[PDB]
Write an enzyme that holds these catalytic residues in place. Structure first.
Site, PDB file in Angstrom:
ATOM      1  N   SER A 181       0.900  -1.254   0.092  1.00  0.00           N
ATOM      2  CA  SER A 181      -0.091  -0.063   0.289  1.00  0.00           C
ATOM      3  C   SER A 181       0.958   1.293   0.028  1.00  0.00           C
ATOM      4  CB  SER A 181      -0.916  -0.007   1.192  1.00  0.00           C
ATOM      5  OG  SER A 181      -1.436   1.342   1.546  1.00  0.00           O
ATOM      6  N   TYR A 233      -2.318  -0.413  10.717  1.00  0.00           N
ATOM      7  CA  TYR A 233      -2.628  -1.134   9.416  1.00  0.00           C
ATOM      8  C   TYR A 233      -1.278  -0.689   8.351  1.00  0.00           C
ATOM      9  CZ  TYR A 233      -3.625  -1.536   4.685  1.00  0.00           C
ATOM     10  OH  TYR A 233      -3.800  -1.821   3.084  1.00  0.00           O
ATOM     11  N   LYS A 237       1.946  -3.412   6.731  1.00  0.00           N
ATOM     12  CA  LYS A 237       2.262  -3.547   5.246  1.00  0.00           C
ATOM     13  C   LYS A 237       3.859  -3.374   5.375  1.00  0.00           C
ATOM     14  CE  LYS A 237      -1.461  -4.419   3.422  1.00  0.00           C
ATOM     15  NZ  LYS A 237      -1.912  -5.866   2.822  1.00  0.00           N
TER      16      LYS A 237
HETATM   17  N1  LIG Z   1      -8.605  -1.120  -1.274  1.00  0.00           N
HETATM   18  C1  LIG Z   1      -7.540  -0.402  -0.994  1.00  0.00           C
HETATM   19  O1  LIG Z   1      -7.905   0.916  -0.976  1.00  0.00           O
HETATM   20  C2  LIG Z   1      -6.404  -0.920  -0.842  1.00  0.00           C
HETATM   21  C3  LIG Z   1      -5.192  -0.082  -1.130  1.00  0.00           C
HETATM   22  C4  LIG Z   1      -3.850  -0.631  -0.892  1.00  0.00           C
HETATM   23  C5  LIG Z   1      -3.739  -1.990  -0.479  1.00  0.00           C
HETATM   24  N2  LIG Z   1      -4.818  -2.711  -0.279  1.00  0.00           N
HETATM   25  C6  LIG Z   1      -4.640  -4.262   0.165  1.00  0.00           C
HETATM   26  O2  LIG Z   1      -5.161  -5.069  -0.959  1.00  0.00           O
HETATM   27  C7  LIG Z   1      -5.661  -6.103  -0.321  1.00  0.00           C
HETATM   28  C8  LIG Z   1      -7.107  -6.418  -0.972  1.00  0.00           C
HETATM   29  O3  LIG Z   1      -8.217  -5.067  -0.472  1.00  0.00           O
HETATM   30  P1  LIG Z   1      -9.339  -5.111  -0.738  1.00  0.00           P
HETATM   31  O4  LIG Z   1      -9.918  -3.704  -1.032  1.00  0.00           O
HETATM   32  O5  LIG Z   1      -9.801  -6.168  -1.728  1.00  0.00           O
HETATM   33  O6  LIG Z   1      -9.957  -5.560   0.885  1.00  0.00           O
HETATM   34  P2  LIG Z   1     -11.118  -6.712   0.996  1.00  0.00           P
HETATM   35  O7  LIG Z   1     -11.217  -6.614   2.443  1.00  0.00           O
HETATM   36  O8  LIG Z   1     -12.174  -6.518  -0.085  1.00  0.00           O
HETATM   37  O9  LIG Z   1     -10.239  -8.117   0.665  1.00  0.00           O
HETATM   38  C9  LIG Z   1      -9.544  -8.624   1.740  1.00  0.00           C
HETATM   39  C10 LIG Z   1     -10.212 -10.127   1.820  1.00  0.00           C
HETATM   40  O10 LIG Z   1      -9.370 -10.729   2.540  1.00  0.00           O
HETATM   41  C11 LIG Z   1     -10.028 -11.661   3.506  1.00  0.00           C
HETATM   42  N3  LIG Z   1      -9.424 -11.909   4.703  1.00  0.00           N
HETATM   43  C12 LIG Z   1      -8.877 -11.388   5.740  1.00  0.00           C
HETATM   44  N4  LIG Z   1      -8.114 -11.951   6.570  1.00  0.00           N
HETATM   45  C13 LIG Z   1      -8.199 -13.088   6.269  1.00  0.00           C
HETATM   46  C14 LIG Z   1      -7.591 -14.373   6.715  1.00  0.00           C
HETATM   47  N5  LIG Z   1      -6.996 -14.409   7.819  1.00  0.00           N
HETATM   48  N6  LIG Z   1      -7.878 -15.565   5.993  1.00  0.00           N
HETATM   49  C15 LIG Z   1      -8.625 -15.511   4.820  1.00  0.00           C
HETATM   50  N7  LIG Z   1      -8.988 -14.344   4.345  1.00  0.00           N
HETATM   51  C16 LIG Z   1      -8.948 -13.152   4.930  1.00  0.00           C
HETATM   52  C17 LIG Z   1     -11.231 -10.825   3.795  1.00  0.00           C
HETATM   53  O11 LIG Z   1     -12.440 -11.657   4.297  1.00  0.00           O
HETATM   54  C18 LIG Z   1     -11.574 -10.102   2.365  1.00  0.00           C
HETATM   55  O12 LIG Z   1     -12.302 -10.706   1.608  1.00  0.00           O
HETATM   56  C19 LIG Z   1      -5.535  -6.102   1.034  1.00  0.00           C
HETATM   57  O13 LIG Z   1      -4.072  -6.782   1.311  1.00  0.00           O
HETATM   58  C20 LIG Z   1      -5.443  -4.558   1.555  1.00  0.00           C
HETATM   59  O14 LIG Z   1      -4.648  -4.127   2.710  1.00  0.00           O
HETATM   60  C21 LIG Z   1      -6.019  -2.292  -0.583  1.00  0.00           C
HETATM   61  O1  LIG Z   2     -16.274   9.751   3.557  1.00  0.00           O
HETATM   62  C1  LIG Z   2     -15.276  10.254   3.146  1.00  0.00           C
HETATM   63  C2  LIG Z   2     -14.023   9.381   2.840  1.00  0.00           C
HETATM   64  C3  LIG Z   2     -12.858  10.041   2.342  1.00  0.00           C
HETATM   65  N1  LIG Z   2     -12.814  11.440   2.131  1.00  0.00           N
HETATM   66  C4  LIG Z   2     -11.510  12.063   1.497  1.00  0.00           C
HETATM   67  O2  LIG Z   2     -11.381  11.276   0.319  1.00  0.00           O
HETATM   68  C5  LIG Z   2      -9.911  11.031   0.215  1.00  0.00           C
HETATM   69  C6  LIG Z   2      -9.695   9.488   0.070  1.00  0.00           C
HETATM   70  O3  LIG Z   2      -9.681   9.050   1.347  1.00  0.00           O
HETATM   71  P1  LIG Z   2     -10.066   7.320   1.415  1.00  0.00           P
HETATM   72  O4  LIG Z   2     -10.987   6.738   0.230  1.00  0.00           O
HETATM   73  O5  LIG Z   2     -10.592   6.994   2.838  1.00  0.00           O
HETATM   74  O6  LIG Z   2      -8.714   6.620   0.992  1.00  0.00           O
HETATM   75  P2  LIG Z   2      -7.256   7.368   1.778  1.00  0.00           P
HETATM   76  O7  LIG Z   2      -7.665   7.714   3.309  1.00  0.00           O
HETATM   77  O8  LIG Z   2      -6.363   8.002   0.812  1.00  0.00           O
HETATM   78  O9  LIG Z   2      -6.643   5.956   1.882  1.00  0.00           O
HETATM   79  C7  LIG Z   2      -7.333   5.083   2.763  1.00  0.00           C
HETATM   80  O10 LIG Z   2      -6.259   4.837   3.708  1.00  0.00           O
HETATM   81  C8  LIG Z   2      -4.735   4.210   3.455  1.00  0.00           C
HETATM   82  C9  LIG Z   2      -4.083   4.390   4.877  1.00  0.00           C
HETATM   83  O11 LIG Z   2      -3.947   5.589   5.362  1.00  0.00           O
HETATM   84  C10 LIG Z   2      -4.945   3.022   2.845  1.00  0.00           C
HETATM   85  O12 LIG Z   2      -3.929   2.460   2.573  1.00  0.00           O
HETATM   86  C11 LIG Z   2      -5.919   3.156   1.472  1.00  0.00           C
HETATM   87  O13 LIG Z   2      -6.383   1.849   1.283  1.00  0.00           O
HETATM   88  C12 LIG Z   2      -7.190   3.864   1.474  1.00  0.00           C
HETATM   89  O14 LIG Z   2      -8.348   2.995   1.891  1.00  0.00           O
HETATM   90  C13 LIG Z   2      -9.257  11.577   1.445  1.00  0.00           C
HETATM   91  O15 LIG Z   2      -8.701  12.739   1.189  1.00  0.00           O
HETATM   92  C14 LIG Z   2     -10.441  11.603   2.579  1.00  0.00           C
HETATM   93  O16 LIG Z   2     -10.210  12.828   3.263  1.00  0.00           O
HETATM   94  C15 LIG Z   2     -13.812  12.125   2.401  1.00  0.00           C
HETATM   95  O17 LIG Z   2     -13.732  13.413   2.158  1.00  0.00           O
HETATM   96  N2  LIG Z   2     -14.837  11.606   2.831  1.00  0.00           N
END
Ligand SMILES: NC(=O)c1ccc[n+]([C@@H]2O[C@H](COP(=O)([O-])OP(=O)(O)OC[C@H]3O[C@@H](n4cnc5c(N)ncnc54)[C@H](O)[C@@H]3O)[C@@H](O)[C@H]2O)c1
Ligand SMILES: O=c1ccn([C@@H]2O[C@H](COP(=O)(O)OP(=O)(O)O[C@@H]3O[C@@H](CO)[C@H](O)[C@@H](O)[C@H]3O)[C@@H](O)[C@H]2O)c(=O)[nH]1
Ligand SMILES: NC(=O)c1ccc[n+]([C@@H]2O[C@H](COP(=O)([O-])OP(=O)(O)OC[C@H]3O[C@@H](n4cnc5c(N)ncnc54)[C@H](O)[C@@H]3O)[C@@H](O)[C@H]2O)c1
Ligand SMILES: O=c1ccn([C@@H]2O[C@H](COP(=O)(O)OP(=O)(O)O[C@@H]3O[C@H](CO)[C@@H](O)[C@@H](O)[C@H]3O)[C@@H](O)[C@H]2O)c(=O)[nH]1
Lengths: 340, 339
Positions: A128, A152, A156
């Site tokens: 991330s 969190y 990572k």
């Molecule tokens: N969505 C984002 O903004 C974002 C950004 C950067 C990184 N990530 C990373 O990407 C990955 C996927 O994110 P996502 O948005 O798809 O989230 P998500 O929650 O939809 O997907 C994660 C999945 O992992 C499963 N899981 C959690 N712990 C588990 C365990 N111990 N055993 C088996 N399954 C387990 C959950 O049930 C879920 O289905 C995560 O590692 C997250 O940290 C997400």
């Molecule tokens: O209800 C909302 C939600 C978000 N934001 C804004 O929208 C932007 C995006 O925020 P969000 O979608 O919550 O993502 P981020 O905070 O940039 O990143 C989150 O948080 C990061 C850790 O800080 C994770 O790594 C990412 O996956 C992501 O979910 C930010 O500027 C927030 O302040 C709002 O104004 N209102």
């Protein structure tokens, strides 16, 4: 069975993993999903089949349970793993750091040991932009200093350190670590997307729920940041572009015979207000909002330098903000209450 | 009950844990020891009882098993924990990182989960000078940049971070993080001491075994360091002084009603050849050595600034290098079988 590979996708019922399972299956890989459904629903797995016409193997398994995980390897000739499994709610991570460390680190440690025991040495890891902490400036490239501002983010950073040490001990390891920025959007069919439990923590799902009528009003967190309109700026990246990145990553490990660490983002930052305007235009629905106070821990600005990924894995974002909004909206409208 | 406290000492059959259990019991605390005996022997517990005349509870348990650990809390009115349980072989940590991360992180996380469940929120954690990586200079103070060069050190850095986060989640937590330098010596009774399995990785047990004649000669890892004699320079600290630092730490958590992070060292570095020379004098035995190549990962020089501990927890190391050698030697002679 596939001659290309048999891919264990942990967390494959979730948002990014489901989209990735789709792209893998479409490209002729066999897929095995392991997900304990802690943040996702079984029906997502059915929908992956409705899209692809193919049935991935599914195991409802806590991947931190090595005995349970080893039974998955017993059953399938896994050639590589993509590790999406994690808890990912920042606010919750501040409140429940032990469970976050335990779940996120033990799920990885368990996978790594079972893989080592079974001589499977190809892994793609979901990292991330949170690993960059408070960025000095954007665009952020991979050689920026690593830190985190919440547990969190720490899970990572610690995962990336663990992976480095595992390869230091056994140089046969091949690790692609992919630092996603802000994934949004959904498969163009509209059949899968992000389905948050409860009130969404993230921007696009909140916007989409405001647009469909499930929530009344978006709150904009902070309107006095050092950005053109004072609201936060992020690199939103289409989740289908992100999913293709994973096929690119696996191919790159093969071709390069070497590990890689690469940002997955567009290189273009959009402010909160720009996102809302784009979504209204793509959806034709109003997204009423109010400007409220900064959310603690938020950075003003964060977006990627996508250069390394272009050179290293031959990958670039294709879909623009309009398409992200349009595709996220199609999923929301056609699935107003999410999966089933 | 003790009026002072009932302290869970994880890893309490081990070297520093056993010495600390002794100081706790002697100062009127009740003690519950949980140790899976992966790097120690049950006999050590009998020795603690012998030294003190008190009987600490003992549970042969893997503290990463949260269910087993919860059963310990069920049985005892725990008021604080001191967490010594870890694997600590630096070389093995490079070869076996998964095992190190799992053991060292899960044991702490299981402990913290159970403590939160039972609302016990005072903890003392065994950290290490390894968190300073390659120091820019000595004496090292607590504000120096943190980094590590091996998975073992990584586990200490990660632990320190996890502990800050547990307090960020619930600000009633009080955490004393203690960064030990190089503990040596033994309780003056000679009934407990350092009991390594196989050939010792660390300096003084190797020197003591050379002096008694179990090992033929000391290997000196490098002789071309930017130090006075070209050999590594370290802050050796008497394990009894160290153990005493834990009682000081517990008290300070109460007094300042605030968490603390301090070095536990003497502030004085001694070279490899200076240790050899002092051991010879205290034991009356010769210690032969061969000058050999540097040990990868070894730092030229590392010693503590003891100022923050003196100020923050009211503690100073009292025992000198002579006393460290004599006490280590008594343990060595009286216990050829170890435990
Ligand atoms: N969505 C984002 O903004 C974002 C950004 C950067 C990184 N990530 C990373 O990407 C990955 C996927 O994110 P996502 O948005 O798809 O989230 P998500 O929650 O939809 O997907 C994660 C999945 O992992 C499963 N899981 C959690 N712990 C588990 C365990 N111990 N055993 C088996 N399954 C387990 C959950 O049930 C879920 O289905 C995560 O590692 C997250 O940290 C997400
Ligand atoms: O209800 C909302 C939600 C978000 N934001 C804004 O929208 C932007 C995006 O925020 P969000 O979608 O919550 O993502 P981020 O905070 O940039 O990143 C989150 O948080 C990061 C850790 O800080 C994770 O790594 C990412 O996956 C992501 O979910 C930010 O500027 C927030 O302040 C709002 O104004 N209102
Ligand atoms: N030079 C040093 O000895 C030194 C320096 C700095 C820090 N430390 C730290 O001090 C602490 C104690 O070190 P030590 O020299 O006494 O080592 P030690 O091996 O004698 O003691 C550690 C004890 O922990 C026990 N243990 C390990 N994992 C366990 C688990 N999962 N559950 C229950 N018990 C477990 C072992 O059996 C052992 O008795 C460790 O955390 C170590 O990393 C040691
Ligand atoms: O057989 C030996 C053993 C050690 N030394 C030297 O003696 C000094 C002390 O070595 P040792 O007793 O192994 O301690 P350190 O390497 O300083 O540190 C120990 O080991 C870790 C780093 O290796 C630390 O994190 C602590 O746990 C501590 O126990 C070093 O200069 C060594 O090079 C020798 O010359 N010969």
């Amino acid at each position: 069975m596939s001659t290309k590979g048999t891919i264990l996708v942990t967390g494959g019922a979730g948002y990014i993993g489901s989209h990735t399972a789709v792209e893998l299956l479409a490209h002729g890989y066999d897929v095995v999903i392991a997900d304990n459904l802690v943040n996702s629903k079984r029906e997502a797995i059915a929908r992956i089949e409705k899209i692809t016409g193919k049935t991935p193997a599914f195991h409802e398994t806590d991947v931190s349970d090595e005995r349970a995980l080893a039974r998955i390897f017993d059953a399938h000739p896994i050639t590589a793993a993509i590790h999406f499994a994690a808890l990912k709610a920042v606010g919750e991570s501040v409140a429940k750091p032990i469970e976050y460390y335990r779940n996120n680190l033990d799920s990885l440690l368990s996978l790594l040991r079972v893989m080592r025991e079974r001589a499977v040495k190809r892994i793609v890891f979901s990292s991330s932009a949170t690993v960059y902490g408070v960025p000095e400036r954007s665009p952020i490239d991979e050689t920026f200093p690593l830190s985190a501002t919440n547990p969190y983010g720490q899970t990572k950073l610690m995962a990336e350190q663990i992976l480095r040490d595992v390869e230091a001990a056994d140089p046969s390891w091949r690790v692609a670590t992919l630092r996603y920025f802000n994934p949004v959007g959904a498969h163009e069919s509209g059949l899968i997307g992000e389905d948050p439990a409860g009130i969404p923590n993230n921007l696009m799902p909140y916007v989409a729920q405001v647009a469909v009528g499930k929530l009344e009003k978006l709150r904009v967190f902070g309107s006095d940041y050092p950005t053109p309109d004072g609201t936060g700026v992020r690199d939103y990246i289409h989740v289908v572009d992100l999913a293709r990145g994973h096929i690119a990553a696996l191919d790159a490990l093969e071709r390069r015979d070497a590990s890689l660490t690469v940002n997955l983002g567009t290189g273009r930052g959009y402010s909160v207000l720009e996102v809302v305007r784009a979504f209204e235009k793509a959806s034709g629905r109003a997204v009423p909002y109010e400007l409220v106070a900064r959310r603690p821990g938020d950075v003003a600005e964060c977006y990627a330098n996508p250069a390394a990924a272009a050179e290293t894995i031959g990958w670039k974002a294709e879909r623009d903000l309009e398409r992200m909004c349009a595709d996220h909206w199609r999923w929301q409208e056609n699935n107003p209450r999410g999966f089933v």
